[PDB]
Amino acid sequence: DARNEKQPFYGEHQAGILTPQQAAMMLVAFDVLASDKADLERLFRLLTQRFAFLTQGGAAPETPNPRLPPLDSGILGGYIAPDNLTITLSVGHSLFDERFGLAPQMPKKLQKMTRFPNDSLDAALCHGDVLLQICANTQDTVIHALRDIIKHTPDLLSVRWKREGFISDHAARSKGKETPINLLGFKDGTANPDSQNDKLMQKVVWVTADQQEPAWTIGGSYQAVRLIQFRVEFWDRTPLKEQQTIFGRDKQTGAPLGMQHEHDVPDYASDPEGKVIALDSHIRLANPSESSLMLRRGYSYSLGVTNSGQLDMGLLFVCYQHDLEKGFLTVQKRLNGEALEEYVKPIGGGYFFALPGVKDANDYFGSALLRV
Amino acid sequence: DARNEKQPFYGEHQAGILTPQQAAMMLVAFDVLASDKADLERLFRLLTQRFAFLTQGGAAPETPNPRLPPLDSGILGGYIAPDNLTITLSVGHSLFDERFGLAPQMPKKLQKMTRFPNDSLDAALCHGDVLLQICANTQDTVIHALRDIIKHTPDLLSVRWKREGFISDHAARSKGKETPINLLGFKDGTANPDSQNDKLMQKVVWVTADQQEPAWTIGGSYQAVRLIQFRVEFWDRTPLKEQQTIFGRDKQTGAPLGMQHEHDVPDYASDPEGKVIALDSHIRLANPSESSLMLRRGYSYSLGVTNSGQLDMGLLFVCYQHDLEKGFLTVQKRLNGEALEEYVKPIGGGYFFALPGVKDANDYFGSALLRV
């Protein structure tokens, strides 16, 4: 009966951020084709309506006049089940250019993503005016949603880049209780702050009034996205010892090395030379610090074969933070040069600002941004 | 869970052919790196052993000495559930070249796939010495299977091309009783023969003693694979009347136009002009069926974006038949110039011969072939 599960669309915050991870996901970046601020308002209102309909589900729209394109693609049949669908909308640095008059309202820390030292960024997979993160129980529901959105926006959005991902169904069914395993065989996001902790998320994830930010951003979140390829054949031919030294964790339990429990926290002072957990390990380089927390919500991906002839698979890394500079930008800078860099290759993604929630059916996306 | 269901590896025939379609699938073609006929036998013996284990399931091979690479990728955790996994092995025309002295054993109808008029074949996505079709309930299991095979064959196999696909859960759960919907929103394989009719399958799918085939092919099947992109944005802008005219079928029920039930058979003699079912429709051009019958077992796929900037999604078409000339080559020839060609573009795949089954733990793939 999973197909009848509903995630609330409206509220203070968008869904898809704190929501426990569903098994299927798609990241889709678009170029906005809106001529002006008025055309942009038309887009934001239209997306509000579609996402509101798709996430709550219902009878598929009817085509009484068959001389018209069908009102629905029909790929789900006669009923559009909610299937735990969430659709989260975020906006890129580029939307705040000269086209729509939004430059003065730009979030304080929003920037175009520029490369870090280990990156191999492909222009075809970077940035975008808007990004949708579309998640549901099944890939069918996510594809149906995308196509509904595209059908309704041929004059306003143009697909830029897109990638689909997944986590295991067991980890998905645990509703945030059991950690997803990534394609390198290690547990992913073990040390995430508690997303059910109301008060913590207010500090870690959500933009609040006490930050120097334009008021329209309150209730939104900075979103960093990284498309990261893994060298899986090479990884699978690397000793388990070296695998564990790279992550700083026991592979089977996900416990930090020299410890018992998955969510154990190490004391680095006892090991100043990195003899138990290496100075260049992923866990250790990521936190020497009290303020650099973020919420990771990443998915695995598996595609075809790379140009060089290797398996194309890896991670769709997504994280949310009250402040991009204090979170991802600070954490990645700490990680530059880590041992994991031999096995991973960032090739795309970007930085975006996830809008505050649509309060109710009389509100629409970015109403506050577009009014001021 | 569903994870505990198993499909028999051993038999007169390989599994994954008559087997009801599981929800997740991968097609993976490989170049064979074997130096000679002994190397090829070694490969075929090793693949029997891997597939026998993976498909039946068990605890993950453990790594007591961490100085060695892990014996298992670990992506499934500590236990390898069978999860309805089937792995079907097939061989290409190219295997019967000079390398292994098997040229005189080449099945009668086996050939390299050459282009049809509406094809835009991409060489990186065609042919291969061997193809595996790896199907399971979940994508995790399929990717785990692939990585185990690859870990065990670094000197014997090199991945050539790979594509992953799916059907709906809805249809997956019905064990073949409900037809999967494709990404054009039409039911897929409605007119398939009954795969439970052993004697019809002997006529349609299986190679038998009566054909003029090398003895080793008996209990095998010819396999046609086609990677087919859909112009989906364009399709979704197309009148429903035209969509139905193109297929020759009602979109919602799958009934041939003019008729009532999904499985109704039309009277073409009554409508020689094709006023009701068009002469260039998919249903009618395909069937004027008899000895051109074949078993279709295709999957949807959804990847990134095309070089043109459009959604990359479509069909992984797979069909099995006793004679490649009489099935796929005959039917695709009938279909040259069909109205659907405006909306589809085949870009890859190829022809293969699916080996006879491995009858027991003392047998192995291609044993009848690898003698004389």
Side-chain angles (χ1 to χ4, degrees):
Chain A
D1 288 309
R3 84 158 193 173
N4 302 315
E5 298 186 43
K6 293 180 189 170
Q7 292 297 321
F9 167 70
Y10 299 106
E12 197 186 11
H13 304 292
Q14 295 193 75
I17 301 178
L18 269 30
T19 311
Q21 295 176 279
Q22 306 97 316
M25 198 251 245
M26 170 189 307
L27 286 171
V28 198
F30 291 91
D31 305 312
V32 167
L33 303 178
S35 286
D36 60 16
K37 176 152 156 159
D39 287 358
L40 184 63
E41 189 192 321
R42 181 166 59 94
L43 174 63
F44 279 14
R45 288 177 179 269
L46 182 58
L47 296 178
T48 311
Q49 297 183 314
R50 301 324 297 160
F51 296 3
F53 167 71
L54 289 162
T55 58
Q56 299 319 291
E62 203 77 57
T63 306
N65 179 6
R67 292 182 299 283
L68 286 177
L71 296 197
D72 188 78
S73 56
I75 69 172
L76 305 184
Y79 179 59
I80 310 313
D83 205 36
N84 270 319
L85 177 69
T86 60
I87 308 174
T88 308
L89 165 60
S90 63
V91 292
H93 185 266
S94 67
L95 199 74
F96 297 89
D97 72 358
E98 69 291 340
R99 289 169 290 168
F100 315 112
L102 309 173
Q105 303 309 303
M106 200 185 67
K108 292 327 178 184
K109 309 309 183 69
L110 192 53
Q111 74 162 71
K112 188 181 216 185
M113 173 178 71
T114 203
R115 73 174 303 270
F116 294 89
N118 186 55
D119 286 4
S120 298
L121 302 182
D122 189 326
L125 305 168
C126 288
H127 323 308
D129 279 331
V130 301
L131 177 75
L132 303 185
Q133 170 198 277
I134 310 175
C135 302
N137 295 330
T138 67
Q139 168 160 36
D140 310 55
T141 297
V142 176
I143 294 163
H144 171 272
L146 174 59
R147 265 173 71 188
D148 174 285
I149 296 152
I150 288 171
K151 190 206 185 297
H152 283 86
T153 53
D155 58 324
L156 291 161
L157 288 177
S158 186
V159 181
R160 186 184 173 89
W161 59 263
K162 168 195 171 284
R163 282 268 171 294
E164 292 194 36
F166 65 97
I167 58 160
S168 68
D169 279 291
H170 193 273
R173 272 186 260 85
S174 88
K175 281 169 168 67
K177 281 175 279 158
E178 182 188 282
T179 319
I181 299 161
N182 69 31
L183 285 163
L184 298 182
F186 280 71
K187 283 154 190 50
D188 210 56
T190 291
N192 256 337
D194 177 22
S195 50
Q196 283 176 345
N197 188 328
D198 41 73
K199 204 194 157 222
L200 186 64
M201 295 305 93
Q202 290 194 350
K203 309 155 193 293
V204 172
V205 165
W206 304 125
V207 179
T208 43
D210 51 301
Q211 297 178 224
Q212 265 202 331
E213 298 279 2
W216 77 266
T217 62
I218 296 157
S221 184
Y222 283 93
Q223 173 200 60
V225 175
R226 302 273 282 169
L227 271 35
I228 301 165
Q229 211 165 256
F230 293 165
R231 304 183 170 89
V232 302
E233 301 95 332
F234 177 31
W235 181 252
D236 283 0
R237 298 186 198 290
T238 301
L240 174 62
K241 184 177 170 68
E242 181 164 12
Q243 285 189 17
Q244 302 184 153
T245 302
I246 285 163
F247 273 97
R249 287 172 186 285
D250 180 272
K251 193 161 183 190
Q252 323 217 312
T253 62
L257 289 167
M259 306 197 79
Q260 287 308 289
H261 314 100
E262 194 192 311
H263 312 88
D264 267 327
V265 178
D267 170 47
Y268 299 123
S270 315
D271 176 28
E273 300 279 279
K275 301 173 173 300
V276 190
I277 299 170
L279 288 332
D280 69 346
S281 71
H282 193 71
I283 190 184
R284 179 156 191 163
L285 272 198
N287 43 234
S289 214
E290 300 193 48
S291 82
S292 62
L293 287 171
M294 63 209 195
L295 182 66
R296 292 172 283 155
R297 191 176 190 281
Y299 282 78
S300 294
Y301 80 80
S302 184
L303 308 189
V305 179
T306 72
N307 189 61
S308 69
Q310 279 77 75
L311 300 170
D312 190 351
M313 36 173 88
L315 187 63
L316 308 174
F317 174 89
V318 182
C319 70
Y320 295 96
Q321 314 117 120
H322 70 96
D323 189 298
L324 185 65
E325 184 200 328
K326 291 176 177 182
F328 179 76
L329 290 182
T330 290
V331 180
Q332 190 49 59
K333 179 184 54 52
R334 284 173 198 174
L335 286 170
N336 288 341
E338 68 178 316
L340 189 60
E341 297 185 348
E342 186 165 19
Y343 288 93
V344 305
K345 177 163 96 177
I347 61 172
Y351 304 150
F352 307 85
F353 192 76
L355 301 190
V358 189
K359 287 175 194 156
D360 61 29
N362 301 309
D363 197 14
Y364 62 93
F365 284 117
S367 65
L369 169 50
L370 292 173
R371 275 170 172 153
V372 69
Chain B
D1 212 311
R3 277 167 288 170
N4 289 121
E5 188 171 30
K6 314 172 198 201
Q7 300 288 319
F9 176 65
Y10 296 109
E12 187 198 340
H13 310 297
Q14 295 190 72
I17 297 168
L18 297 190
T19 311
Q21 293 180 281
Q22 311 94 315
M25 198 235 20
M26 174 196 304
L27 293 168
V28 62
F30 290 95
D31 303 315
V32 157
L33 305 178
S35 270
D36 52 43
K37 200 183 166 170
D39 259 14
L40 188 69
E41 177 181 323
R42 186 166 61 87
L43 172 61
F44 280 11
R45 299 184 85 107
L46 181 55
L47 301 173
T48 41
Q49 160 203 137
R50 300 323 301 169
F51 305 176
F53 168 73
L54 295 164
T55 58
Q56 304 317 298
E62 216 165 55
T63 307
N65 190 349
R67 291 159 200 83
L68 291 182
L71 276 55
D72 189 88
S73 61
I75 66 159
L76 300 183
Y79 200 91
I80 316 307
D83 204 36
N84 278 319
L85 179 70
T86 60
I87 312 175
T88 305
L89 170 64
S90 63
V91 301
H93 181 258
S94 60
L95 205 72
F96 303 84
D97 69 0
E98 265 170 319
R99 285 168 300 159
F100 313 112
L102 305 166
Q105 286 302 328
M106 199 198 78
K108 248 51 181 153
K109 305 310 168 64
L110 190 51
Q111 65 176 72
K112 203 207 210 69
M113 178 178 80
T114 57
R115 71 174 307 275
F116 290 92
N118 181 58
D119 287 5
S120 295
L121 300 189
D122 178 340
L125 308 168
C126 301
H127 326 300
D129 284 330
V130 303
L131 180 71
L132 309 184
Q133 173 198 283
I134 310 173
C135 307
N137 305 325
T138 56
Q139 177 168 22
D140 267 73
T141 300
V142 169
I143 288 162
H144 176 269
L146 175 61
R147 273 165 72 184
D148 177 280
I149 296 148
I150 287 174
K151 193 199 71 96
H152 284 83
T153 56
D155 57 326
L156 294 166
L157 293 172
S158 178
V159 187
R160 179 187 181 100
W161 60 262
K162 168 194 169 276
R163 276 278 177 288
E164 291 191 46
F166 65 92
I167 57 165
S168 76
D169 322 56
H170 213 317
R173 261 179 249 86
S174 74
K175 320 294 205 194
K177 271 180 247 164
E178 183 179 296
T179 322
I181 299 169
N182 60 37
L183 290 165
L184 303 179
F186 282 71
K187 283 164 171 47
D188 205 53
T190 291
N192 257 334
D194 169 50
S195 44
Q196 294 176 343
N197 193 325
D198 289 23
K199 218 255 184 146
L200 174 74
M201 292 304 87
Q202 220 73 232
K203 297 204 192 73
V204 178
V205 177
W206 305 125
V207 170
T208 43
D210 62 83
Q211 300 169 236
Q212 308 291 15
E213 289 289 357
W216 76 265
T217 61
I218 294 159
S221 188
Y222 283 92
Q223 186 198 49
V225 169
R226 302 269 281 172
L227 275 30
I228 306 183
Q229 278 181 3
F230 298 164
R231 307 180 166 93
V232 290
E233 302 97 329
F234 183 35
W235 183 251
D236 290 345
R237 269 190 289 99
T238 293
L240 168 65
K241 213 184 196 99
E242 188 179 343
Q243 287 187 8
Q244 296 179 156
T245 299
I246 283 155
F247 275 105
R249 289 184 185 276
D250 178 274
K251 190 161 192 193
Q252 312 198 339
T253 70
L257 296 169
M259 315 204 75
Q260 301 308 324
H261 311 118
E262 171 155 358
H263 296 98
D264 272 339
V265 182
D267 182 49
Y268 296 143
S270 280
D271 184 30
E273 294 180 284
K275 314 194 166 194
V276 174
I277 295 176
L279 300 174
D280 62 0
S281 64
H282 197 70
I283 187 178
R284 190 172 180 160
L285 261 192
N287 297 284
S289 212
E290 60 298 89
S291 50
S292 73
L293 224 73
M294 69 205 187
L295 189 59
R296 284 170 295 158
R297 200 177 186 278
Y299 282 81
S300 293
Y301 81 85
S302 178
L303 219 41
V305 186
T306 64
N307 290 341
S308 307
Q310 300 297 84
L311 301 179
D312 189 355
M313 48 180 82
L315 184 67
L316 304 182
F317 175 92
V318 187
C319 69
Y320 293 99
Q321 59 257 281
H322 67 273
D323 187 300
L324 178 66
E325 194 189 352
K326 282 196 144 196
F328 187 78
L329 302 180
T330 292
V331 184
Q332 184 59 44
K333 187 158 189 75
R334 292 185 190 157
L335 288 167
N336 296 348
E338 73 181 307
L340 184 68
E341 291 185 352
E342 184 172 11
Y343 295 92
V344 304
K345 184 164 75 170
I347 61 168
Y351 309 142
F352 303 92
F353 192 78
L355 302 183
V358 184
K359 69 168 196 59
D360 63 47
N362 300 129
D363 200 13
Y364 62 90
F365 285 118
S367 60
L369 173 61
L370 283 167
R371 286 193 276 280
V372 86

